[PDB]
Symmetry: D2
Subunit: 214 residues, 4 copies
């Protein structure tokens, strides 16, 4: 496709719904705040809406290379703060995916340019868990790192002043760490689910151990 093609597809697409199912735009026209914040990868192999079967506007979304939650990235932190303190989302999902180009670039470490800086946050994880990854079959390491990464980001998110404050105020917010593959688009729960400053630390330590023992 080319630009004129997308514009044509939209023109036709819109013309239908506006005559066929006008109700579609009526539902969107409703000021219904999203209940979920989806933090995923720019690769966007399978759109979050399609993966979860959710209607348009039910998901507040943020995407960056390799779905990271860097302690000091004000882009993601701002998305999170608006979602939590203003939209008051009930759930936050950090979703990674096996085969992610970002994660792979972090390991193979080619000289890609500017992006390698952002990817060093993933290499820190690669090293941090060098014992767990080394005690594994080579062709399983990238998929494992992919899970470790999501788990580390969930942890980072829980430690952010935004979440600590939300939880201290007693606000009900739950963060999840998910992952999926393009061979079945089936979501796998990495069970690092946190609902407060306590369950966050335990579920994290437990999430990691599981992989370390299984």
């Amino acid at each position: 496709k080319d630009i004129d093609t997308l514009i044509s597809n939209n023109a036709l697409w819109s013309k239908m719904l506006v005559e066929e199912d006008p109700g579609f735009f009526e539902k969107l026209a409703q000021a219904q705040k999203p209940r979920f914040l989806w933090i995923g990868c720019s690769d966007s192999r399978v759109p979050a809406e399609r993966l979860t079967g959710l209607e348009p506007g039910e998901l507040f979304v943020h995407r960056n290379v390799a779905n990271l939650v860097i302690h000091t990235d004000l882009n993601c932190l701002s998305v999170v703060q608006y979602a939590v303190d203003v939209l008051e989302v009930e759930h936050i999902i950090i979703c990674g995916h096996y085969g992610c180009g970002g994660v792979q670039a972090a390991v193979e470490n080619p000289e890609l340019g500017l992006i390698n800086n952002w990817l060093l946050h993933i290499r820190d994880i690669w090293f941090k868990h060098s014992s767990l990854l080394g005690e594994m079959p080579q062709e399983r390491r990238l998929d494992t790192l992919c899970e470790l990464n999501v788990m580390e980001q969930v942890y980072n998110l829980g430690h952010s002043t935004i979440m600590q404050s939300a939880w201290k105020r007693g606000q009900k917010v739950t963060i999840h760490g998910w992952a999926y593959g393009i061979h079945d688009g089936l979501l796998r729960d990495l069970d690092v689910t946190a609902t407060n400053r306590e369950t966050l630390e335990q579920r994290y330590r437990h999430g990691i151990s599981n992989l370390k023992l299984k």
Copy 2:
């Protein structure tokens, strides 16, 4: 709730695997996206559905109010990776009328940390105060939404990432669009640039023509 999502995903997967056991094979066939879509976290209408693109055809970045801040490494990293590594041919910055981020910037309510990010939009509101001034107070937010996309397109074109990509002769086109929720119809703000010179020319006329419509 959450449980529902995992269920929808389970069924959806099963259903597709049965109806089209190739659907996922198609995705498996590693296909590099040809487009980079920079939109708002509000994501009122998925980019895939607006453009009629299938999964994987779009590399995507979303932040509040679809900004391209000169010094935001998050967005810049997505752009550099898409341009230098994926070699996308097109970059689309798309805004949407009624955007909460845009409205929050004008009304200026005390929302917390997010207000710092929104100050970049307030800069635009004040930058175009005359143009917006001589205009019905009602149409101002929608115009600011358009001005914002146009300004972010301008920023994107001025980034060292785009300036060096164009300098080495790489073919990359950046676009500025916007759509409304009442019809989901995309509007080309006409600031499409293929190099440094047209970026300047399109921005100039882009703003100038608004002061005519």
Copy 3:
């Protein structure tokens, strides 16, 4: 070279310990800085020497061209810590004429990554194009240096950190200064603000008076 530095440090330390064995005790007496100095990495003349302040009396931040970007967490963290934790009474943003960062922004040479950071200064150059235009092309860089400090002061005052500090009644004053290398004499750009309202008023008159001098 490096070796020289360690030697100078060795001797300097010895010499002080012998002349004033209390000098270091003085520093030891944990004293919270009352001022935050935001200057340029060029650091032509140390802040301590310009102001006649002794070590530890200044909490400091330096970046290229002394910017306070709305969304730069580096500078914002230094500001929040100094304001909410150290409780500094004054914040000074100081620029200097002949600044390489400021000049690089106007001349626009291809310097690499740093050009993205400098785009914030180019925004200011274009923002005040009329004022700078009706002016000798020779005095433009120096004026841009002043405009830049004034704009960064404005940004600092609009940050949620300063807005919430002032809202809770905390006493914090922000200043905008500049000095030249030919005399190291500080010039108050007169954009001193103690709250939200005066920040706006001082900025307005600050720019307006320049269009008079």
Copy 4:
């Protein structure tokens, strides 16, 4: 002192040099590029110029809370890139100091607000070396972390695309990790000195081991 006091001190200070030693401003008037980039802490207990006995303008400087070099902080990365690629500094010094309020806030972890996000990068180090720090007398841990921090930043700096590129191009640049105390203002070399992509990795591993064995 108050604002009017600083302005007065400057007025008097300037009036002297301009009549006493006009040569001072003549030397500055010379377009002599700095040969060193100093990355230190905002605390600035003892000014870098005074610590090294260097004249004004001989040091390009950057300061942030706890002298960090975050993989993705474009503020510091931009200072570094300008210094290395434009000024062509020969040496880069990351200097920490014992007693640093930032490092201490990272450990004690009080609820300071926004700043705690930036400090999580130091807590990652605290945990990373939990074995080395735990096998130590409590009242020695903060000073140790202070060194570990500087060492980790030097490492981060060496891994940045800016340094990797400079070294690949064959440009001569050396990065050092220093530290000092306010009891004597004496600079201590943490010997993690890197001059290329090779010495960087070894000196790092060695720098850490030393503390781990001594």
